[PDB]
Amino acid sequence: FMKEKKRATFYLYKNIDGRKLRYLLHKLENVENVDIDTLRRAIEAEKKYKRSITLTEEEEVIIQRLGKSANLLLNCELVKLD
Amino acid sequence: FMKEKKRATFYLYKNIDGRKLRYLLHKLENVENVDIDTLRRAIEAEKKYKRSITLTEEEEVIIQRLGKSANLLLNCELVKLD
Question: What CATH number has the domain bearing residue A16?
Fold first, then answer.
């Protein structure tokens, strides 16, 4: 129904704060593809840090658009950020 | 040590034969990135078919280059093929 005030939980290879997590999610709005090297690094990284954020309506649709690819893509952005 | 005559085992969303599996692996030699839509589809697909091939020396290095991203990338190629 939208504007559900729910949290999206992610597992990252770095224990980043919500501020950075939210930054990465929004960066995905302009991502069209992921380079093979970046994908390998994100996949091989140990994603053991559980980080969550309560979504705004705008973020809910980004999460819905990405579906199950969200966690990996967020880790890919983190690799690119670093 | 190379030329190990070992099998690489993959899990695909379609029960393709070794002929096609090998085709997809070689196609990855020219892949530089994966589009976001294709990645989501490959991630969300139920990869329940176990398919294996014994690697030639040339294929061993492709597998080594891809590392843990091989299975997902193969599924991405399968999505692109279809």
Answer: 3.30.70.3260
